[PDB]
Structures are given as C-alpha cells and as structure tokens.
Design a protein around this ligand. Structure first.
Ligand SMILES: NC(=O)C1=CN([C@@H]2O[C@H](COP(=O)(O)OP(=O)(O)OC[C@H]3O[C@@H](n4cnc5c(N)ncnc54)[C@H](OP(=O)(O)O)[C@@H]3O)[C@@H](O)[C@H]2O)C=CC1
Ligand SMILES: CCOc1ccc(OCC)c(NCc2cnc3nc(N)nc(N)c3c2C)c1
Length: 164
C-alpha cells in the first residue's frame, strides 16, 4: 500500500557526502528535495540527522524519523527508530514515506523501495575512501532522465526518476 521512496543528490562520480557535509551548493536541488518530501514522513540515519543545519532540524511539515542502533538516542522533535521496519511503522498511513539518507540508511532501505528520486550533479569530486557514497540501482529499476540544466550556482545538474 505504501510506496517507499529514496531521495538523494550525488556527483556523477557517486559521492553524496564528504567531511560529514554535502560538498556542493545547488539551490535547485534543495528546491526539488523540499518539493518531493513536503507533507510526508522523512526517515534518516543518525549521522544525517546530526548533519542537518540547526535552522531546519527537525525538518518542518514532515514527520521526522531518525534511525539509530541506540534506542536511548535523543532527537528533539523527531521519533527515534531502531530499524527500517520500525521507521516504516512510524510512517503510519502516509502513502509515500521518503528515506532521505545517508549512505548506510539508503542501503538498508533499498530492498523496501519502489521509487527513487535522484539529482545528478556535474562536479569534479574524485571519490575518496572516507566519502559517503550513493547506492547503486540494479536492473529491476526503470528510469526516466531529464535534461541537463544550468544552476544559478554555476554547476550543471539533472533529475532522474526511477520506479519498480
Ligand atoms: N547528498 C545527499 O542527498 C545527502 C547526503 N548526506 C550525507 O551523507 C553523510 C551521512 O551518511 P552516513 O555517514 O552513511 O550516515 P547515515 O545518515 O546513514 O547514518 C548512519 C547511522 O545510522 C544508524 N544505522 C546504520 N545502520 C543501522 C542499522 N542497521 N540499524 C539501526 N541503525 C543503523 C547508525 O546510528 P548510531 O551510530 O546512532 O547507532 C549509524 O551511525 C553526510 O556526509 C551527509 O551530509 C545525507 C543525506 C542526503
Ligand atoms: C527542508 C530543507 O532541507 C534541507 C535544507 C538544507 C540542507 O543543507 C543545507 C547545507 C539540507 N541538507 C540535507 C539534504 C540536502 N539535499 C538533499 N538533496 C536531495 N536531493 N536529497 C536529500 N536527501 C538531501 C538532503 C537530505 C536539507
């Protein structure tokens, strides 16, 4: 009944995070992310929660769920869950909960997911051993890809939407 989605931005090289942060600024991607997730449950790993800017934590108008192995973790204004299955239970009757990162939580959620919304960013980031990486999609997914677009930031980006 519920369609579980994943939403992320990556470099063409597959990087989603570096130094505990996102290593670009593409406002158009932030706009997309906001539009995808407004009004829905958003599920995220503990590190992603801690990486959010304090002026958007918890994310407004969304039910925030934070996944940790530590049931005692305190996340003000969010629900803490000990597994993806527990996180999805907190979504309740939300028809389209979203998993919003990071690398570890995407891999946990991927086998439950039926939708992925991906932003690809043309930025010269050579992937390093400590980088947080995007999940790889297999042949079960079918996608449509939008045109490359020029950002007001100067970078080129494009949107992909995958379903199965
Ligand atoms: N470009 C993008 O679209 C986005 C990028 N980011 C970036 O990604 C990075 C964060 O990713 P990552 O470091 O992988 O961290 P995650 O956000 O995936 O958080 C990982 C944490 O999740 C919990 N966890 C992992 N596996 C399990 C499990 N099996 N059961 C219960 N809890 C589990 C643990 O919390 P605990 O240690 O408390 O037990 C672990 O430390 C940052 O750089 C961030 O900026 C984040 C979101 C989107
Ligand atoms: C509702 C506002 O959300 C955010 C605002 C600003 C932010 O950082 C500023 C440096 C945010 N950071 C996390 C974040 C940023 N961009 C993203 N882009 C995409 N496409 N998907 C995400 N999951 C995703 C996430 C989780 C999220």
């Amino acid at each position: 009944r519920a369609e579980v989605g994943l939403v992320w931005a990556q470099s063409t090289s597959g990087v989603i995070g570096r130094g505990g942060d996102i290593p670009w600024s593409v406002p158009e991607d932030l706009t997309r992310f906001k539009e995808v997730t407004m009004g829905h449950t958003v599920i995220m790993g503990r590190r992603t929660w801690e990486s959010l800017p304090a002026k958007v934590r918890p994310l407004p108008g969304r039910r925030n769920v934070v996944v940790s192995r530590r049931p005692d973790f305190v996340a003000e204004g969010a629900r803490v869950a000990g597994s993806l299955e527990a996180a999805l239970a907190y979504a309740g009757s939300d028809p389209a909960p979203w998993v919003i990162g990071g690398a570890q939580i995407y891999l946990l959620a991927l086998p439950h997911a039926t939708r992925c919304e991906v932003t690809e960013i043309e930025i010269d980031l050579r992937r390093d051993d400590d980088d947080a990486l995007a999940p790889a999609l297999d042949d079960s997914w079918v996608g449509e890809t939008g045109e490359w677009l020029a950002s007001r930031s100067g970078l080129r980006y494009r949107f992909h939407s995958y379903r199965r």
